[PDB]
Amino acid sequence: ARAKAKTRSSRAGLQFPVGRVHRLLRKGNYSERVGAGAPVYLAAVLEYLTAEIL
DNA sequence: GCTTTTTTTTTTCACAATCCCGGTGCCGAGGCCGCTCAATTGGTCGTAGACAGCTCTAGCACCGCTTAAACGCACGTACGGAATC
Ligand SMILES: [Ca+2]
Ligand SMILES: [Ca+2]
Ligand SMILES: [Cl-]
């Protein structure tokens, strides 16, 4: 148990910050609990809507 | 049909404005540096919700009368809408 480094954005194959998105969900008063996929799905959508506009 | 006009459309140009080009200069996009704080890891601990099994609500199908409501036509009158000053 000392095996560190990887980011969730990298796991999901994304550019947008999954971790940040997660925190933002958690800190936003949206729901008491937040699934582990919730931010991944969301971030990916924001990536796509961002990419489409650009 | 006449002639004799006034209008509309064509042709013609002048001219005004906007578009295109190469050149110059500034500053903010862009990328890097060096520090830090927030994302990550691995722990623990508890309950949310996924599940299975059961109750009984209420949503659907159907039937068969009774009108109120939709339909389809005749009829003419006011309306929408062109033209003109
Ligand atoms: Ca329950
Ligand atoms: Ca059930
Ligand atoms: Cl999830």
PDB file of N, CA and C and ligand atoms in Angstrom, chain A residues 34-39, ligand 3:
ATOM      1  N   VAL A  34     -22.849  11.112  -4.196  1.00  0.00           N
ATOM      2  CA  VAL A  34     -22.474  11.253  -5.594  1.00  0.00           C
ATOM      3  C   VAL A  34     -21.723  10.015  -6.057  1.00  0.00           C
ATOM      4  N   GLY A  35     -22.315   9.289  -6.996  1.00  0.00           N
ATOM      5  CA  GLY A  35     -21.687   8.115  -7.578  1.00  0.00           C
ATOM      6  C   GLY A  35     -20.343   8.396  -8.208  1.00  0.00           C
ATOM      7  N   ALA A  36     -19.544   7.348  -8.352  1.00  0.00           N
ATOM      8  CA  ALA A  36     -18.195   7.489  -8.900  1.00  0.00           C
ATOM      9  C   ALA A  36     -18.187   7.719 -10.404  1.00  0.00           C
ATOM     10  N   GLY A  37     -19.257   7.308 -11.086  1.00  0.00           N
ATOM     11  CA  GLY A  37     -19.401   7.515 -12.532  1.00  0.00           C
ATOM     12  C   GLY A  37     -19.974   8.868 -12.917  1.00  0.00           C
ATOM     13  N   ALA A  38     -20.821   9.406 -12.037  1.00  0.00           N
ATOM     14  CA  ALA A  38     -21.435  10.726 -12.201  1.00  0.00           C
ATOM     15  C   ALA A  38     -20.486  11.792 -12.760  1.00  0.00           C
ATOM     16  N   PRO A  39     -19.382  12.068 -12.055  1.00  0.00           N
ATOM     17  CA  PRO A  39     -18.496  13.083 -12.610  1.00  0.00           C
ATOM     18  C   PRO A  39     -17.849  12.658 -13.926  1.00  0.00           C
TER      19      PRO A  39
HETATM   20 CL    CL C   3     -22.229   6.451 -10.537  1.00  0.00          CL
END
